[PDB]
Enzyme design. Structure first.
Site, PDB file in Angstrom:
ATOM      1  N   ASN A   1    -101.271  -7.802 -80.268  1.00 43.19           N
ATOM      2  CA  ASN A   1    -101.471  -8.992 -79.045  1.00 43.19           C
ATOM      3  C   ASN A   1    -101.052  -9.255 -78.593  1.00 43.19           C
ATOM      4  O   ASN A   1     -99.730  -8.526 -78.370  1.00 43.19           O
ATOM      5  CB  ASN A   1    -102.077 -11.041 -79.777  1.00 43.19           C
ATOM      6  CG  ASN A   1    -102.823 -10.744 -81.194  1.00 43.19           C
ATOM      7  OD1 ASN A   1    -103.810 -10.155 -81.199  1.00 43.19           O
ATOM      8  ND2 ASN A   1    -102.440 -10.887 -82.268  1.00 43.19           N
TER       9      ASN A   1
ATOM     10  N   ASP B   1     -99.319 -11.894 -77.151  1.00 44.88           N
ATOM     11  CA  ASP B   1     -98.001 -12.528 -77.375  1.00 44.88           C
ATOM     12  C   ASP B   1     -96.994 -11.951 -78.656  1.00 44.88           C
ATOM     13  O   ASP B   1     -95.784 -12.325 -78.292  1.00 44.88           O
ATOM     14  CB  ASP B   1     -98.048 -13.845 -77.864  1.00 44.88           C
ATOM     15  CG  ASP B   1     -99.304 -14.353 -79.183  1.00 44.88           C
ATOM     16  OD1 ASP B   1    -100.459 -13.590 -78.767  1.00 44.88           O
ATOM     17  OD2 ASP B   1     -98.864 -14.067 -79.930  1.00 44.88           O
TER      18      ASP B   1
ATOM     19  N   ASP C   1    -102.670  -9.137 -86.026  1.00 48.12           N
ATOM     20  CA  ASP C   1    -103.945  -8.970 -86.374  1.00 48.12           C
ATOM     21  C   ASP C   1    -103.905  -8.207 -87.811  1.00 48.12           C
ATOM     22  O   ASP C   1    -103.902  -7.071 -87.268  1.00 48.12           O
ATOM     23  CB  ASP C   1    -104.835  -9.363 -85.775  1.00 48.12           C
ATOM     24  CG  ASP C   1    -105.018 -10.514 -84.483  1.00 48.12           C
ATOM     25  OD1 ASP C   1    -104.377 -11.586 -85.630  1.00 48.12           O
ATOM     26  OD2 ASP C   1    -105.540 -10.755 -83.988  1.00 48.12           O
TER      27      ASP C   1
ATOM     28  N   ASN D   1    -103.412 -13.007 -88.541  1.00 45.57           N
ATOM     29  CA  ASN D   1    -102.903 -13.294 -87.105  1.00 45.57           C
ATOM     30  C   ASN D   1    -101.032 -13.974 -88.072  1.00 45.57           C
ATOM     31  O   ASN D   1    -100.680 -14.741 -88.428  1.00 45.57           O
ATOM     32  CB  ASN D   1    -103.072 -14.173 -86.180  1.00 45.57           C
ATOM     33  CG  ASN D   1    -102.328 -14.568 -85.314  1.00 45.57           C
ATOM     34  OD1 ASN D   1    -101.506 -13.326 -84.213  1.00 45.57           O
ATOM     35  ND2 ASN D   1    -102.440 -15.495 -84.586  1.00 45.57           N
TER      36      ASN D   1
ATOM     37  N   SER E   1     -97.611 -10.689 -81.850  1.00 44.92           N
ATOM     38  CA  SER E   1     -97.977 -11.155 -82.937  1.00 44.92           C
ATOM     39  C   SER E   1     -99.195  -9.882 -83.363  1.00 44.92           C
ATOM     40  O   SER E   1     -99.601  -9.207 -82.296  1.00 44.92           O
ATOM     41  CB  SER E   1     -99.052 -12.375 -83.275  1.00 44.92           C
ATOM     42  OG  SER E   1    -100.010 -12.022 -82.552  1.00 44.92           O
TER      43      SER E   1
ATOM     44  N   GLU F   1    -114.667  -8.247 -86.446  1.00 40.18           N
ATOM     45  CA  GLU F   1    -113.280  -8.191 -86.056  1.00 40.18           C
ATOM     46  C   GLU F   1    -112.672  -6.703 -87.320  1.00 40.18           C
ATOM     47  O   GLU F   1    -111.829  -6.048 -86.052  1.00 40.18           O
ATOM     48  CB  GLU F   1    -112.439  -9.277 -87.232  1.00 40.18           C
ATOM     49  CG  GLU F   1    -113.074 -10.512 -86.507  1.00 40.18           C
ATOM     50  CD  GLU F   1    -112.498 -11.076 -85.785  1.00 40.18           C
ATOM     51  OE1 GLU F   1    -111.388 -10.048 -84.753  1.00 40.18           O
ATOM     52  OE2 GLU F   1    -112.224 -12.872 -85.281  1.00 40.18           O
TER      53      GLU F   1
END
EC number: 3.2.1.17
Length: 129
Positions: free
Chosen positions: A46, A48, A52, A59, A50, A35
């Protein structure tokens, strides 16, 4: 801060992640490696809108507040900047909440596609436990 493999294993154990909700320590180290590549300051946007954050890529859609994710929630009750610290306490507490939400470690796509089913015990091999 970029952690060593056995340094993060030790930190994760101290903070009570080993066997949390039945997931062995190697499962958590494996999820960190893919990650964030063990880097506490990693950020990724992301599609959308958002973002991380941190060593476990939490998120801003559901778990933390970054101020620019419209319609999102703040279920861990922290600023997303607190996930980017050298001390992993804030990340670990939020991770514990995520893994209990009913889909287990499936909530981390990198875990599902790259760690799940594999020999995770290899990640903690050679560390003083």
């Amino acid at each position: 801060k970029v952690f060593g493999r056995c340094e993060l294993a030790a930190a994760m154990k101290r903070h009570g992640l080993d066997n949390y909700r039945g997931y062995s320590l190697g499962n958590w180290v494996c999820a960190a490696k893919f990650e964030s590549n063990f880097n506490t300051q990693a950020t990724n946007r992301n599609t959308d809108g958002s973002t991380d954050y941190g060593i476990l890529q939490i998120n801003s859609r559901w778990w933390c507040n970054d101020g620019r994710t419209p319609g999102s929630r703040n279920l861990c009750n922290i600023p997303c900047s607190a996930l980017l610290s050298s001390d992993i306490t804030a990340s670990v507490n939020c991770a514990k909440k995520i893994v209990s939400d009913g889909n287990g470690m499936n909530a981390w796509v990198a875990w599902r596609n790259r760690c799940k089913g594999t020999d995770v015990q290899a990640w903690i091999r050679g560390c003083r436990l």
